[PDB]
Design a protein around this motif. Structure first.
Motif, PDB file in Angstrom:
ATOM      1  N   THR A 156     101.755   3.556 120.253  1.00  0.00           N
ATOM      2  CA  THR A 156     102.108   3.611 118.843  1.00  0.00           C
ATOM      3  C   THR A 156     102.110   5.048 118.312  1.00  0.00           C
ATOM      4  N   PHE A 157     102.751   5.243 117.175  1.00  0.00           N
ATOM      5  CA  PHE A 157     102.709   6.529 116.502  1.00  0.00           C
ATOM      6  C   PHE A 157     101.259   6.935 116.271  1.00  0.00           C
ATOM      7  N   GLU A 158     100.435   6.004 115.809  1.00  0.00           N
ATOM      8  CA  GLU A 158      99.021   6.280 115.558  1.00  0.00           C
ATOM      9  C   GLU A 158      98.225   6.638 116.812  1.00  0.00           C
ATOM     10  N   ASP A 159      98.556   6.027 117.950  1.00  0.00           N
ATOM     11  CA  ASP A 159      97.959   6.417 119.228  1.00  0.00           C
ATOM     12  C   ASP A 159      98.177   7.896 119.482  1.00  0.00           C
ATOM     13  N   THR A 160      99.409   8.356 119.294  1.00  0.00           N
ATOM     14  CA  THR A 160      99.731   9.751 119.583  1.00  0.00           C
ATOM     15  C   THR A 160      99.070  10.682 118.574  1.00  0.00           C
ATOM     16  N   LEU A 161      98.971  10.262 117.319  1.00  0.00           N
ATOM     17  CA  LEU A 161      98.258  11.050 116.315  1.00  0.00           C
ATOM     18  C   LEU A 161      96.788  11.208 116.654  1.00  0.00           C
ATOM     19  N   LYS A 162      96.161  10.134 117.127  1.00  0.00           N
ATOM     20  CA  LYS A 162      94.746  10.169 117.480  1.00  0.00           C
ATOM     21  C   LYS A 162      94.501  11.144 118.638  1.00  0.00           C
ATOM     22  N   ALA A 163      95.368  11.113 119.644  1.00  0.00           N
ATOM     23  CA  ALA A 163      95.228  11.997 120.790  1.00  0.00           C
ATOM     24  C   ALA A 163      95.411  13.441 120.351  1.00  0.00           C
ATOM     25  N   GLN A 164      96.404  13.674 119.505  1.00  0.00           N
ATOM     26  CA  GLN A 164      96.715  15.013 119.049  1.00  0.00           C
ATOM     27  C   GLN A 164      95.621  15.587 118.136  1.00  0.00           C
ATOM     28  N   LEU A 165      95.032  14.744 117.288  1.00  0.00           N
ATOM     29  CA  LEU A 165      93.991  15.217 116.387  1.00  0.00           C
ATOM     30  C   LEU A 165      92.755  15.596 117.208  1.00  0.00           C
ATOM     31  N   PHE A 166      92.416  14.796 118.221  1.00  0.00           N
ATOM     32  CA  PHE A 166      91.348  15.163 119.152  1.00  0.00           C
ATOM     33  C   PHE A 166      91.629  16.522 119.780  1.00  0.00           C
ATOM     34  N   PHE A 167      92.838  16.694 120.287  1.00  0.00           N
ATOM     35  CA  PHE A 167      93.206  17.941 120.942  1.00  0.00           C
ATOM     36  C   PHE A 167      92.999  19.141 120.009  1.00  0.00           C
ATOM     37  N   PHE A 168      93.448  19.026 118.764  1.00  0.00           N
ATOM     38  CA  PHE A 168      93.397  20.167 117.848  1.00  0.00           C
ATOM     39  C   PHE A 168      92.021  20.433 117.261  1.00  0.00           C
ATOM     40  N   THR A 169      91.092  19.486 117.368  1.00  0.00           N
ATOM     41  CA  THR A 169      89.805  19.637 116.682  1.00  0.00           C
ATOM     42  C   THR A 169      88.556  19.508 117.551  1.00  0.00           C
ATOM     43  N   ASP A 170      88.587  18.715 118.616  1.00  0.00           N
ATOM     44  CA  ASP A 170      87.372  18.515 119.405  1.00  0.00           C
ATOM     45  C   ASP A 170      86.875  19.814 120.047  1.00  0.00           C
ATOM     46  N   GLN A 171      85.555  19.984 120.097  1.00  0.00           N
ATOM     47  CA  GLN A 171      84.980  21.221 120.607  1.00  0.00           C
ATOM     48  C   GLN A 171      84.449  21.132 122.021  1.00  0.00           C
ATOM     49  N   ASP A 172      83.831  20.004 122.368  1.00  0.00           N
ATOM     50  CA  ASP A 172      82.981  20.004 123.569  1.00  0.00           C
ATOM     51  C   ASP A 172      83.260  18.958 124.624  1.00  0.00           C
ATOM     52  N   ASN A 173      84.153  18.019 124.330  1.00  0.00           N
ATOM     53  CA  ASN A 173      84.514  17.027 125.334  1.00  0.00           C
ATOM     54  C   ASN A 173      85.647  17.535 126.230  1.00  0.00           C
ATOM     55  N   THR A 174      85.306  18.062 127.402  1.00  0.00           N
ATOM     56  CA  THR A 174      86.301  18.720 128.238  1.00  0.00           C
ATOM     57  C   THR A 174      86.975  17.789 129.233  1.00  0.00           C
TER      58      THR A 174
END
Ligand SMILES: C=C1[C@@H](O)[C@@H]2O[C@]3(CC[C@H](/C=C/[C@@H](C)[C@@H]4CC(C)=C[C@@]5(O[C@H](C[C@@](C)(O)C(=O)O)CC[C@H]5O)O4)O3)CC[C@H]2O[C@@H]1[C@@H](O)C[C@H](C)[C@H]1O[C@@]2(CCCCO2)CC[C@H]1C
Length: 187
Positions: A156-174
């Motif tokens: 879904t569009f929302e699936d891709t948004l969730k993945a992208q928001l993680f990518f742009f903001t997450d700090q420590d989950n590598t």
């Protein structure tokens, strides 16, 4: 602000690298790199052709608002890789950052989802993701399984948004597959 993690900076270098390459691998980009990149994007993604008249504005807004924090910079201004990383750090702390990513993503999504279904098949998502990221090994990142956690065969569009928001903001989950929403990381 605090300081970004080394991993987050690596993710931001991964965002910047293809733009650097487009501009001639000079270590910096300019407004002109993005303006010239409009034609390149129309060739790579002819799904964007129906809205091709909006592309120059999209490139210019990307330069001013995303890359340069909303500031009108002098003609010929050269934005370096390390500077983009620090500008992105300020950007993701903006109250409207999540909305800005969603609005930009909507422009792409509307070209690939013409019937406005809100989803595409997982196989379609895999082919399109390979095109977007230029990562021929994108499927092996696990990202399609991590997005479609219920195995619907839909992305879904929302699936891709969730993945992208993680990518742009997450700090420590590598290790999470959402790290690879833009393809393999650069050094
Ligand atoms: C494409 C992209 C990203 O790159 C793009 O990143 C952002 C951050 C920085 C980038 C800005 C790029 C500008 C320089 C260009 C300049 C011009 C004139 C137009 C434009 O063009 C962008 C697409 C493209 C091609 O031209 C590009 O340059 O990126 C979209 C916004 C437009 O204003 O911005 O915009 C946010 C929006 C986001 O939107 C989509 C993103 O949602 C795609 C989504 C994540 C994908 O998910 C999947 C599954 C997960 C794995 C990856 O594949 C399947 C396919 C697809 C749905």
């Amino acid at each position: 602000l605090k300081e970004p993690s080394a991993h987050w900076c690596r993710k931001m270098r991964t965002v910047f690298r293809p733009w650097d390459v487009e501009g001639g691998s000079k270590g910096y980009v300019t407004e002109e790199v993005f303006k010239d990149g409009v034609q390149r994007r129309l060739e790579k993604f002819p799904e964007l052709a129906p809205t091709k008249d909006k592309m120059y504005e999209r490139s210019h807004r990307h330069w001013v608002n995303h890359c340069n924090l909303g500031v009108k910079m002098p003609e010929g201004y050269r934005l370096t890789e390390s500077q983009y990383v620090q500008n992105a750090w300020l950007l993701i702390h903006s109250p409207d950052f999540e909305a800005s990513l969603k609005e930009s993503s909507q422009t792409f999504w509307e070209g690939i989802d013409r019937e406005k279904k809100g989803y595409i098949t997982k196989e379609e998502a895999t082919k399109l993701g390979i095109r977007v990221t230029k990562d021929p090994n994108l499927k092996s990142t696990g990202i399609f399984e991590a997005m479609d956690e219920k195995n619907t065969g839909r992305i879904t569009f929302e699936d891709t948004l969730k993945a992208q928001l993680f990518f742009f903001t997450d700090q420590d989950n590598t290790t999470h597959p959402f790290n690879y929403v833009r393809g393999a990381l650069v050094d």
